[PDB]
Design a protein around this ligand. Structure first.
Ligand SMILES: NC(=O)c1cnn(CCO)c1
Length: 165
């Protein structure tokens, strides 16, 4: 299963790892994507996960959007995990750089509770503009299922572990 994770709480674990490499090695049941409402996987975790699927994630996502319309900020959808996982849970955290409500981060993490175990990034962190320390706090206070967080940046990983209350 997952290896080298530091245990933060009863159910939250964390590792300094590229979620793409973690997904390829583990092939978890669920990999979480840091999605936007349009499922346009252009950069950040989304661009990296999509590029690992050879764009199959984007092709599937465009068909999903053509049929269903955009997701809500704080919402999610379950699609294929392609070569990375059985499923990909596309979760839309608020993007602070697009002036979205940071209060929606708790709603976004609530989506994780529908899956017993997940490999995930910190929602709204990175190019989404939120404070990753705040995202980790909302994660451990909202997610009750088993979440294995992959933090790409080593310096940030150390900052998150060393400041975790
Ligand atoms: N895991 C990440 O946050 C991330 C962002 N870009 N990339 C490119 C290499 O996979 C990885």
């Amino acid at each position: 299963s997952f290896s080298g994770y530091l245990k933060l709480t009863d159910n939250v674990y964390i590792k300094n790892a590229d979620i793409v490499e973690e997904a390829k090695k583990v092939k978890p049941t669920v990999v979480v994507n840091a999605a936007n409402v349009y499922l346009k996987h252009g950069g950040g975790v989304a661009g990296a996960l999509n590029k690992a699927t050879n764009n199959a994630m984007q092709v599937e996502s465009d068909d999903y959007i053509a049929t269903n319309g955009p997701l809500k900020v704080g919402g999610s959808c379950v699609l294929s995990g392609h070569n990375l996982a059985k499923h990909c849970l596309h979760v839309v955290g608020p993007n602070v750089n697009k002036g979205e409500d940071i209060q929606l981060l708790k709603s976004a993490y609530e989506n994780f509770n529908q899956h017993e175990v997940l490999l995930a990034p910190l929602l709204s962190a990175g190019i989404f503009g939120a404070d990753p320390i705040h995202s980790l706090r909302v994660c451990v206070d909202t997610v009750r299922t088993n979440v294995y967080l992959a933090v790409f940046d080593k310096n940030l990983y150390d900052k998150l572990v060393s400041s975790f209350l």
